[PDB]
Enzyme design. Structure first.
Site, PDB file in Angstrom:
ATOM      1  N   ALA A 169       0.828  -1.017  -0.262  1.00  0.00           N
ATOM      2  CA  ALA A 169       0.128  -0.289  -0.114  1.00  0.00           C
ATOM      3  C   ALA A 169       0.792   0.760  -0.183  1.00  0.00           C
ATOM      4  CB  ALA A 169      -1.239   0.022   1.227  1.00  0.00           C
ATOM      5  N   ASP A 170       0.512   1.795  -0.882  1.00  0.00           N
ATOM      6  CA  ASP A 170       1.460   3.423  -1.229  1.00  0.00           C
ATOM      7  C   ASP A 170       0.442   4.385   0.137  1.00  0.00           C
ATOM      8  OD1 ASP A 170       3.426   3.181  -3.458  1.00  0.00           O
ATOM      9  OD2 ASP A 170       1.191   3.221  -4.034  1.00  0.00           O
ATOM     10  N   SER A 171       1.057   5.417  -0.278  1.00  0.00           N
ATOM     11  CA  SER A 171       0.669   6.319   1.246  1.00  0.00           C
ATOM     12  C   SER A 171      -1.017   7.041   0.216  1.00  0.00           C
ATOM     13  CB  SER A 171       1.102   7.955   1.303  1.00  0.00           C
ATOM     14  OG  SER A 171       3.096   7.647   1.020  1.00  0.00           O
TER      15      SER A 171
END
Length: 76
Positions: free
Chosen positions: A33-35
């Site tokens: 998961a990215d930001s």
């Protein structure tokens, strides 16, 4: 039902399963998961639990347990 809300929010947001979500499961390392999904996920966490999460401890959330441990004590 804090466990159901926490696990349901992550599983529903990324299309994963609540039973596949572990307490020691890293968000970026396993789900990648990215930001975008972490900021939005905590964004939804603020709207649903009604609490605030600063970047001071935001940069500490790395696993599912970081999300539950910090919000469970931040609920009140």
């Amino acid at each position: 039902d804090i466990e159901q809300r926490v696990k349901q929010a992550v599983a529903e947001q990324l299309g994963l399963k609540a039973e596949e979500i572990k307490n020691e499961a890293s968000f970026m390392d396993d789900l990648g998961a990215d930001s975008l999904d972490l900021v939005e996920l905590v964004m939804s966490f603020e709207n649903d639990f009604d609490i605030t999460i600063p970047d001071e401890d935001s940069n500490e959330i790395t696993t599912v347990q970081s999300a539950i441990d910090y919000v469970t004590k931040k609920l009140g």
